[PDB]
């Protein structure tokens, strides 16, 4: 029954006067997108604030053993290589234990083939004895075009194949896959795996079998998988054209575009038209400056309250100088912990991420999209796509009148900056000390 004090940074009332971690087990033949999924899921989970880390058994093998030479290493009759592979799995599990039990981790993604019941049974046993949950994700695909595309995009360029050309790396990889085919026992949720928590994904997200979801992190993972796709597309992110508050160095508010902001809007329209995209969706916030920017495009657009700039609470409409003079401790606390700091009666970047989550989910479902938003919001989105930490997120550089063009490549995202040659003030503030 305790008396309360409001914490300085997060503004949380706390009393004063003195969920088991999960191992996600990937399952499947090589080149079925296990690593692609492990990495993308981990980016999502970390961004929403669930500390996650991938333990790729392949990387342990590459460190334990000299340069790769061929698929013979993966022969099931290779007694020695089988021992090494098993010890690499056990070493990766030691690190999973340490991460989840001792380093604050919440989710460990065990990224390997794990194609045998025996291997999976051993992982289960490891989980139950450390009191970890286990959740299996299996990717099944028998389409040779898909497999070949995966091999060309991320396998032949890997360090294993440094001394091979393309044709021979591809030949080797195909034989390598064949090494796993005889002993591959797929997840069997009807019968033998009836009691496991799992998702089996068939044909690149065409069909799912989902068995026994045990907690909210798991249903959300499932929802995420049911919304992502691997079709090629482009995401453009930018801010509103310069506005009248920007000219005054004032934060928040709902001002309109300055004369230069309107020139940017016309320049954006020209840029978009020259990209020559199919079915470009345009999203804005509900604040005037983004909507006036979209109005220059002559494309249909949709407004989202969730894309509204961070709410600076009682500091809305003020300059950073007025904040420093009127609220000196608040100004200092934010410079010290810019991600977690909440403005009084307002928001933190942490809050932003919670309200942007539905934006991210819908972005995953779409194809070509242009998002016209605001500085702190744009940083949050960009952090997601580029896998930037919470500590880095509030300092990412997203200038006015510059389009950030994002294109999926390999296991991530390429970003290209395109400045549309219209002057503006600069609203970027570096980390100080
Ligand atoms: C959509 N969803 C829900 C989902 C779920 C699980 C796997 C995959 C998947 C993803 C994938 N991606 C991937 C893997 N390596 C290189 C490039 C890419 S790509 C297409 O992202 O540029 C390749 C796959 N292959 C076979 C089966 N499944 C694959 C997808
Ligand atoms: O987190 P920072 O660096 O203060 O940036 C957010 C600010 O940027 C702006 O979008 C432009 O100054 C403000 O409206 C908002 O308060």
UniProtKB/Swiss-Prot annotation:
Family matches, as CDD domains: HP_PGM_like
Tissue distribution: Ubiquitous.
Protein name: 6-phosphofructo-2-kinase/fructose-2,6-bisphosphatase 3
GO CC field: cytosol; nucleoplasm
Positions marked as site (Transition state stabilizer): 239, 246, 374
Active site: 111, 141, 240 (tele-phosphohistidine intermediate), 309 (proton donor/acceptor)
Entry keyword annotation includes ATP-binding: yes
């Amino acid at each position: 029954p305790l008396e309360l004090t409001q914490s300085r940074v997060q503004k949380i009332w706390v009393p004063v006067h003195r969920n088991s971690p999960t191992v996600i087990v990937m399952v499947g033949l090589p080149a079925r997108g296990k690593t692609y999924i492990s990495k993308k899921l981990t980016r999502y989970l970390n961004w929403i604030g669930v500390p996650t880390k991938v333990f790729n058994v392949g990387e342990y093998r590459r460190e334990a053993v000299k340069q790769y030479s061929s698929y013979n290493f993966f022969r099931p009759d290779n007694e020695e290589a089988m021992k090494v592979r098993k010890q690499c799995a056990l070493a990766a599990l030691r690190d999973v234990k340490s991460y989840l039990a001792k380093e604050g981790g919440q989710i460990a993604v065990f990224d390997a083939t794990n194609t045998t019941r025996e291997r999976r049974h051993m992982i289960l046993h490891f989980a139950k004895e450390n009191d970890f949950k286990a959740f299996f994700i299996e990717s099944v695909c028998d389409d040779p075009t898909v497999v070949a595309s995966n091999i060309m995009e991320v396998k032949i360029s890997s360090p294993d194949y440094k001394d091979c050309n393309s044709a021979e790396a591809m030949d080797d990889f195909m034989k390598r896959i064949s090494c796993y085919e005889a002993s591959y026992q797929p997840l069997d949720p009807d019968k033998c795996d009836r009691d496991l928590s799992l998702i089996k994904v068939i044909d690149v997200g065409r069909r799912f079998l989902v068995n026994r979801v045990q907690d909210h992190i798991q249903s959300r993972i499932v929802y995420y998988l049911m919304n992502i796709h691997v079709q090629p597309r482009t995401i453009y992110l930018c801010r509103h054209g310069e506005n009248e508050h920007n000219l005054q160095g004032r934060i928040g508010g709902d001002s309109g575009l300055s004369s230069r902001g309107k020139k940017f809007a016309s320049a954006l329209s020209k840029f978009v038209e020259e990209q020559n995209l199919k079915d470009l969706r345009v999203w804005t916030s509900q604040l005037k400056s983004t909507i006036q920017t979209a109005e220059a495009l002559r494309l249909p657009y949709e407004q989202w309250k969730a894309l509204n700039e961070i709410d600076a609470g009682v500091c809305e409409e003020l300059t950073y100088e007025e904040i420093r003079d009127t609220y000196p401790e608040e100004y200092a606390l934010r410079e010290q912990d810019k991600y977690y700091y909440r403005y009084p009666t307002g928001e933190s970047y942490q809050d932003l991420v919670q309200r942007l989550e539905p934006v991210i989910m819908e972005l995953e479902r779409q194809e070509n999209v242009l998002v016209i938003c605001h500085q702190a919001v744009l940083r949050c989105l960009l952090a997601y796509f580029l896998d930037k930490s919470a500590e880095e997120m509030p300092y990412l550089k997203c200038p006015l009148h510059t389009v950030l063009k994002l294109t999926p490549v390999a296991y991530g995202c390429r970003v290209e900056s395109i400045y549309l040659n219209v002057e503006s003030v600069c609203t970027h503030r570096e980390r100080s000390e």
